[PDB]
């Protein structure tokens, strides 16, 4: 059950009640497609049906040409955030594929998949991989296609032999279009890279918990968007690429989303107002005794009450950062603010409603679709829940509120920007903390007092 | 069309006038359904070749259908000086529509209204009257043409023309699923698979707007699609329904202008003794309801040669006196915004009808013609050159191109305002401010220096 | 072969050893698909094999009509710190508007009547090599025109549907892409430009044969850096402009800069001052100056070669190279930023990983087989990738380039220790070495005279 609190005193909001799925590990597997080494050229005859085998046979040499160029390439992920300088996310799959490039690794695959279509392959340089045959084009091409090419005089048969070769190429050709427009590395993992059957199975044969197995299966569209598929080789009549799947080694811990907006004084004199915005907006999830914080919006994906994030894109904070929602002046964690003189209207749509910051002569309203205007916001920072509100307007900008189901609570309090004397309030867009502003106030009180010695 | 441009030397900036507005203020939503037929009975022996083909194309028909059910189970969304934005949700109104279709009993209501015909308005329940279109009727084809073949245990293997025909009639159904599954069921731009021009043009032409707005959308169908969303909803009870959300241009043929700025720095020799200044709120500006809507980010507004298509969701409402800054940056009615610094480095900005060059220090700043070559060499300072004679511009080892789009430019002569500032008290840490807010900081230092005269 | 130096003095590393491939110019060709002008069925009847062709002709027309809506829609893309703004496809938009002039198409069609490849001088001075990649007009006018465009029309065989589909394929995909991409696409696909045409088009380019091997062996990078521009479908020919890159600077040294926060390690929270070298990214020697590429996307790497678009560059003095040898040198004023944020973090370099660790933070470095092999102390420290597979700072795990290369550790005393914390401007001052000196001296000035009593 999702609930939201609003803190009038700091113009912030926490959406509590969520449940974590935090990627911690990776699960790589190798997917092979066995290709039949069709050499070159057709059979003496230009029957339009033989002309048609050519065209579709021209596609297969071309698909192989592209996959041959991506093998030779050095794959790499082309995907206020100066706190992040992260590395690669496919370092583990590149780690398998550079070893698939070693001479003699393809025969080690061909041995393991001789009786089965899935086995764990013990190959060179100290890595095991689950390798899976998903497609056997060797059986087809060399059995009921190649003799019609193995015949220097091919009488093209009934037409349905051209339709069928279109159908067994189709997937391989969809694979190559993805790889070829993504320099080898594709995300999300499509259903042509890994069909539901194969994926729902590959998860099943993942050594994970029953907790993690049921979570991934019920969230397959979430899994594919945070997985990778990585072209590796086409070599010795086999195509292979590595797939890189997320491992959610944190589950069902509490998460919450912080929401923030400017908190300013509301004096009539123009320019003479100072502002205050808590600045660590984003996702927080309890993790391993600390708090994992995801400043990027793009990093986390919600499926109705569960937050899937990638710990690579996160900052580790002590659990006392939670106190920043209890009391910003607590002596245990120096809460982050930043100051300014910019009292400009702006509304933040939260998880269960909207923070509205209205200053000056700005028209700020909250509305129901059938009822009409149900609130007009005064200067200062207010909030409206999502019971009865469908939209919020600030000036001429229209914001839709979330209508999912949850209890809000409005937590009263005095706007803390009232606790500061403006004359010595540092407003030069100063991204600091609570004490580091007090850092400057005592200096500013003293810098005036020292010149008061006469 | 007709586009003009004034380059202001006094402040190292330009404004392009003559554009006319089309600002998105609302969403027109429609329900697009493709009737299906519920089959799971692939019982057929038919070892002969023309059954394997129909078996395989049919299999594609189920794994698409399965992909689409997982999407019904999902909850989609989007995450869409450029920071002040309004954080909202682009597709909240089409998700409202899609919630009712998840209620049980809503599909018959659709089938009741859409029984004979293709386009009707459907009262679903609790505040939903939605235009629904039936864009393809597979059920008839599958009960009438394809059920006789597969569903009989005889399984009379129909002509090869059936294998090809069924491929035609899956293709749209099969491209739609590709698009939804790799975008998580929200797509943009709305693609022709999702909505044809015949379909789109009709929906436009029967949008309850004026023929003007109809005439505008029909002649900018590619802009319209780029600003329209399509959200999958449900595949249920032999019906597939996806919600289509089309932009509604509530502000039309109001004047727009684009603001370009570049740094205005001094040209003293002793290096690092030069101060700078830069007008800040660059972007698109349009006249909108007695106010000015300002769209700081470039990916928002789209131009077709003289018409600017902006989404008001990503705008900032400003008083019509923000126009004063393009008249006099020292005006008393709007506190024009500037940011200041001491790092003076060359850079160039391509305007709508020319290019600003801000040449500073040891840099080679030129502007060339295609036929003649280098036709201008920038002395130190901020200057301008228009597209009447110039094709390109090089600043250091970087080359920009200019628009050969036709339009009268105007070089407005005047003295750079940073010559008015005494460098000793100039605030130039990296102050992100206004003219007066700067002047405020200038007064304090002067006051504290006047005191230090004893 | 690649190497990497870490500078303990200033918590930064430079990775040397790269060869530049800098896109300084463009190269436009026009791609044409000759089409046929054909209209409504005129086959009255509903034969099964005839309804298949009606669908396939409907796709043709719906693709032709949606192409037409692209020929009159102004095409452009939206292609970054103190970087300015340019327009990536103006070289191609130049040609595309000439093709809209009248007569240009018969001039094209004249030179390409017998040959598939020619150079055509259009009526504004500059000429363009133009090429013919699909001739459907002959196919629609010779093989199909008879059947469909006659009142009496036996559908000769079902194979007539198949080849019309197969001859239709590229035109239908070329229309798909141009439609989600408002007539300009990147990277260039093989539907837009197959491999043979591309290799050929490279072959005919006026470049060094060192340059031709470079593109030919990096086609996939070359495609990422090319654009495709929809121009016209009018008077029985579909023409779009391809704009391929001209890497006018080759075989010069490149290097990439990584930096991290360098703070003091007093135990008192907040009593620490930090220091970070700014302007991190890729640098390459270019024409007596050094082009700096601030954005990660602007350069694409193939192991020791860097392909960068110089539109998204900056031209810096070559003395900026001294900021890696002595950040106090009197010839170039090295850029830093001060803070009081002493957070632990890691940066993954070209050959290792920088860990700047602070507070009570657990920062290790681990091997796949061995486990932790180093717990970092409070400070800014480095580790080479021989031995190391991953790094953890808190609960976040970073992998490391396993790329072959040598690293050298340069010991020095952290510069953050050469500052009096009492007068150090640590209010997130994006400034330089001497600009920070100036705030210190001025602060030491108001300290100086106000303390004569
Ligand atoms: C001066 O310092 C005290 C503690 O040293 C701090 O709490 C206070 O906020 C400062 N003065 C003002 C007016 O804030
Ligand atoms: C500074 O204050 C004086 C009054 O002492 C005022 O006249 C002047 O206009 C102020 N400076 C500026 C730049 O407005
Ligand atoms: C600052 O300038 C004064 C000039 O009186 C000079 O004596 C002093 O050495 C300078 N600061 C430093 C750190 O050298």
Numbering used by the authors:
A (entry chain F): 27 to 105, 138 to 512
B (entry chain A): 26 to 105, 138 to 511
C (entry chain B): 27 to 105, 139 to 512
Task: Give me lines lifted from the publication on this model.
Many pathogenic viruses rely on class I fusion proteins to fuse their viral membrane with the host cell membrane. To drive the fusion process, class I fusion proteins undergo an irreversible conformational change from a metastable prefusion state to an energetically more stable postfusion state. However, while both pre- and postfusion states are usually immunogenic, the labile prefusion state has been demonstrated to induce a more potent immune response in multiple viral families. To address these limitations, we developed a general computational approach where the protein’s sequence is optimized for the conformation of interest (here, the prefusion state) while destabilizing the other conformation in silico.
For RSV F, one (R-1b) out of three designs was found to be a monodispersed, trimeric protein, as indicated by size exclusion chromatography (SEC). Compared to the current prefusion-stabilized vaccine DS-Cav1, R-1b exhibited about a 3.5-fold increase in protein expression. Therefore, obtaining the R-1b variant with a melting temperature of 62 °C revealed an effective optimization of the sequence to maintain the prefusion conformation. This result is especially relevant since no disulfide bonds were introduced, and stabilization was achieved only by enhancing non-covalent interactions. The crystal structure of the variants R-1b and M-104 verified their prefusion conformation at a resolution of 3.1 Å and 2.4 Å, respectively. The accuracy of our computational predictions was reflected in the high structural similarity between the determined structures and the computational models, with root-mean-square deviations (RMSDs) of only 1.193 Å (405 Cα atoms) for R-1b and 0.53 Å (416 Cα atoms) for M-104. While no significant perturbations were observed in all our variants overall, subtle differences at the antigenic site Ø were identified between R-1b and its parent RSV F protein. Specifically, the α4 helix in R-1b displayed a bend toward residue D200 compared to the parent protein. Especially precise agreement in rotamer orientation between our computational models and the experimental data was found in cavity-filling mutations, such as E60F in R-1b and the A159L and V203I in M-104. Other mutations, such as the S150E and E487N in R-1b, did not interact with the predicted residues but still contributed to the prefusion stability by enhancing polar interactions at the protomers’ interface.
